[PDB]
């Protein structure tokens, strides 16, 4: 059961990954810095 | 068996927001107020901390008081803030100025009637009232002045009930406020007469808890207030869940307090351990007791090794055997016998509760009455004596109206408290 819980937590982290990257693009970070930043986010 | 909570000042309101988050989580109440729990055991004692609204909703039995609305607006803006009853928010229009005498005498008497009307209205609705629970700092302005004012009024109006306080106290290394010794000394003077039991926590000790035990890289006040909210919700757990050996705030007081002035206690919470390490060690009673008594895990700067235990209490949550609890408390008392006061044959009370907090197999909270608390009072009295001979900042308080004899009385009474602790520490049967 503990393994199931941590897997779901990691999935939630991926979801907030996508949401935060989209929000950051919405604010208006310049494209080259945004690309380098999202590359170092992995 | 229901408690009424009061949260006063910035520290009290901030800790309170996390406390009511923890309690709402424990009873499965959605932040909209709808019950969404998954066992009847959650519902059957919801009355203890919540009042019932009609359709879905539950409302939390708490009064919020502050002198500037900034904090109140912050808690209302928080994720659970809507649950609080709007008529229960009481605030003024100008600050305490970090001054005890202004906060106690000028705006205190102006606001105090409106807080008592709400507190009495909430108390008199209960079918049987258990003690009050108050969170505040002693070093502040509204915390010290309005907390002790309200404590005195509730002790006048309900002298047969229990009065319980949680209190934050100044660190030994760095001050957050310049005038901390005056506010602390006057507030402890008020508490030792008025209060029944007062708990003290040092923020420096919480930082050391976080860094050594939890190893957080970048802790925030949310973490410190989560640790505090966890223990606060834990002490009352046996009041509000079934168990093999029930306990009660009054039952704690009768077993913990040997003499009525000796009611200041130390705190710790045991199953703190990082999520990475938890895979390497299963929970068991020897592990919990060994971690539980390690001074690394105790939430005050004073260390037990300089004093002796008069009494202690341990409240266990989880499904566990009584044999291991009893024999561990015997072995620990026998092996470290010089640190336990010898004219009491067994210093530790145990209690066992069936329902642990979610995601931990077991937990214990520890309550300790130890004489090493005397060094804190001595240090505060020293700093007070340095400030008082020269009236270093005294004109603010005297301009509000206090006579200096109040300051000399409070110093003398605290010094006598230190003497009483020292005499009982070195007493012997002869």
């Amino acid at each position: 059961s503990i393994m199931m819980q941590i897997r779901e937590r990691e999935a939630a982290i991926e979801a907030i990954r996508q949401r935060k990257l989209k929000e950051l693009e919405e604010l208006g970070v310049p494209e080259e810095y945004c690309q380098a930043l999202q590359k170092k986010m992995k | 068996r229901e408690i009424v909570c009061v949260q006063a000042g910035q520290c009290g309101n901030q800790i309170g927001s996390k406390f009511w988050e923890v309690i709402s989580d424990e009873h499965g109440v959605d932040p909209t107020g709808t019950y969404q729990g998954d066992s009847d055991l959650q519902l059957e004692r919801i009355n203890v901390y919540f009042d019932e609204a009609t359709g879905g909703r539950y409302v939390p039995r708490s009064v919020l008081i502050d002198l500037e609305p900034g904090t109140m607006d912050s808690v209302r803006a928080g994720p659970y803030g809507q649950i609080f009853r709007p008529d229960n928010f009481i605030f003024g229009q100008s600050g305490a100025g970090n001054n005890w005498a202004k906060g106690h005498y000028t705006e205190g008497a102006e606001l105090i009637d409106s807080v008592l009307d709400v507190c009495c209205k909430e108390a008199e609705s209960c079918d049987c009232l258990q003690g009050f629970q108050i969170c505040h700092s002693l070093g502040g302005g509204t915390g010290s002045g309005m907390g002790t004012l309200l404590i005195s009024k509730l002790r006048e109006q309900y002298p047969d009930r229990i009065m319980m306080t949680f209190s934050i106290i100044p660190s030994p290394k760095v001050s957050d406020t310049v005038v901390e010794p005056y506010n602390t000394t006057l507030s402890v003077h008020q508490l030792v007469e008025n209060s029944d039991e007062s708990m003290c926590i040092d923020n420096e000790a919480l930082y050391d808890i976080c860094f050594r035990t939890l190893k957080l890289t970048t802790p925030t006040f949310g973490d410190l207030n989560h640790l505090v909210s966890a223990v606060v919700s834990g002490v009352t757990c046996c009041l509000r869940f079934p168990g093999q050996l029930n306990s009660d705030l009054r039952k704690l007081a009768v077993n913990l307090v040997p003499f009525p002035r000796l009611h200041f206690f130390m705190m710790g919470f045991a199953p703190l351990t990082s999520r990475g390490s938890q895979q390497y060690r299963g929970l068991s009673v020897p592990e919990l007791t060994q971690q539980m008594f390690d001074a690394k895990n105790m939430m005050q700067a004073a260390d037990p090794r300089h004093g002796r235990y008069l009494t202690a209490s341990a409240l266990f949550r989880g499904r566990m055997s009584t044999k291991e609890v009893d024999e561990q408390m015997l072995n620990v008392q026998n092996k470290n016998s010089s640190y336990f006061i010898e004219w009491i044959p067994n210093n530790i009370k145990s209690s066992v509760c069936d329902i642990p907090p979610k995601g931990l197999k077991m937990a214990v909270t520890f309550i300790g009455n130890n004489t090493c608390i005397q060094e804190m009072f001595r240090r505060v009295g020293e700093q007070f004596t340095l400030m008082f001979r020269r009236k270093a900042f005294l004109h603010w308080y005297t301009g509000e109206g206090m006579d200096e004899m109040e300051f000399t009385e409070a110093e003398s009474n605290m010094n006598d408290l230190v003497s009483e602790y020292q005499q009982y520490q070195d007493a012997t049967i002869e």
Binding site: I16, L27, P30, Y33 | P31, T32, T220
Partner: protein
Amino acid sequence: LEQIEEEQQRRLNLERAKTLLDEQYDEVKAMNQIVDEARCIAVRNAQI
């Protein structure tokens, strides 16, 4: 229509509370740090 309004009000309130609670963890604090840095570098570039 009152039932529909009540349900949608609960849905919005619950979603707001949920997204407010999710920033109390510790990964999100470091990610706030890194977005501030991205922001700090970009504003600095414009200043030159």
